[PDB]
From Swiss-Prot:
Domain spans labelled Integrase catalytic: 3-148
Shown residues within the full chain: 904 to 1052 of 1124
Domain of life: Viruses
Name of this protein: Integrase
Amino acid sequence: HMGIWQMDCTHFDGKIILVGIHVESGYIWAQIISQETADCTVKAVLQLLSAHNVTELQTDNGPNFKNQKMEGVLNYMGVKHKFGIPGNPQSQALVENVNHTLKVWIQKFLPETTSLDNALSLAVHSLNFKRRGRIGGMAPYELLAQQESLR
């Protein structure tokens, strides 16, 4: 599962959060986007591709993902795109559960930050930089780095 990310939009406190999960490590990337549109979604996905190795994206078929602009960008960047209906187990199996967890952590940080954006960043940080609570457990960020390094 080198380069494989699964992505979905979720909604929290009236805002749209585009969430990307590196499926092999569980590392999370997340950004608030202005609108659930082709243009905002292309913009955010390009930011992810600029920062991380992405070989394939697994999404649902929302019109912000399934459209000529995204199709063209992903072709141009050499990224495979897998999609089906919202919630499908083929390309969206991890998102309900991950978005559930992320929101719990966002809520946790809300009262101690000055913005939703900072609450999100703190929740993401916690999830990426906490070791799995098991004997050999690694943080998702570590698993990411280690997997890429070997690759």
